[PDB]
Design a protein around this ligand. Structure first.
Ligand code: K
Lengths: 207, 192
């Protein structure tokens, strides 16, 4: 429970099913905003149900931020359900539950973004300290597919990843957070996404 | 179009108090200019004067979707619009009055504006006589002379609240009904 991992689909089934996989670390950002790098992807793969992504959140500045947020957030006092209390993971599921891959349409992909809500359905993320647990949450990802994905995750020492560029003004992130509460049916959409992604309970998802 | 006024019910039946954010400490953004007993409830009027808070709200409006949203019926007012997206509700603690993501009681939706008369006129549940009393009281207060609001809370604390607001169940629906309960007349910058 030292490292922070994230995983989920960036797309659930022109097309990018030909520039995959991307095993090289891509930056993980927030709401496609510049200077919001929080970590790196540990692999983008094509699988039966879509393009699955895995990554690690390493940005110390961001982890500090996320940590301060969880301290005052309602998630800090929220009653335990099925899992032990993990403010960090829970605040992430309240704040940035979605995933979005950025690409040009026709260095083919620039980054993966954590966001308030994915534009594509079933693009809900799963945050965790255990990569295997994280990937196993997706019942739509076969055993062989998972084993493969994890092989890539473990083959990389997070300790060798460069420091993410996270300096963006906090106001900019706050504005996105404010705008999110007004995204219509966000909570409903978020609930559907969970199903579309075939995520298994228990998870720290907040909807 | 300089000063910032806020108006709305803190309770719908049918000495200046500080105006804060989500009942948090050190989030005074201004002062209540009066709490009035009107037919439909307790109507509140206040002036948003905190320079720090106004700069922040202004900074937020600049990068918010509100600064890019197409004109509807009214002219663009990023500051007013971000306040209606961020803190559209009111809640009376009398200790203080807080601007919230959603009011504790129904019908407590706020109306932000630069014109106090326009603000109060949005509430058709407030009679003409009541409005005249409220406005006479309002304009009898020179704003450039109220004590500076203590706005020093870490930005983190406010952001946590904004993130939580996003997960308040039925928030946008309750805000819509709150508007009906308060009998607010269009056009207004409310976002629900
Ligand atoms: K491989």
């Amino acid at each position: 429970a030292q490292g922070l991992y994230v995983g989920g689909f960036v797309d659930v089934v022109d097309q990018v099913t030909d520039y995959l996989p991307v095993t090289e670390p891509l930056p993980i950002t927030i709401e496609h905003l510049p200077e919001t790098e929080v970590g790196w992807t540990l692999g983008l793969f094509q699988v039966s149900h879509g393009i699955f992504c895995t990554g690690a959140i390493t940005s110390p500045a961001f982890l500090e931020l996320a940590s301060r947020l969880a301290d005052t957030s309602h998630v800090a006092r929220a009653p335990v359900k099925n899992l032990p209390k993990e403010p960090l993971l829970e605040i992430l599921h309240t704040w940035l539950p979605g995933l979005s891959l950025s690409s040009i349409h026709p260095p083919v992909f620039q980054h993966v973004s954590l966001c308030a809500l994915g534009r594509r359905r079933g693009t809900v993320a799963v945050y965790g300290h255990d990569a295997e647990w994280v990937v196993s949450r997706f019942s739509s990802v076969s055993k062989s597919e998972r084993a493969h994905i994890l092989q890539h995750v473990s083959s990389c020492r997070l300790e060798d990843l460069s420091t993410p560029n996270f300096v963006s003004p906090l106001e900019t992130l706050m504005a996105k957070a404010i705008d999110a509460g007004f995204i219509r049916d966000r909570l409903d959409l978020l609930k559907t996404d969970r199903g579309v992604a075939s995520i298994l309970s228990p998870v720290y998802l907040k909807a």
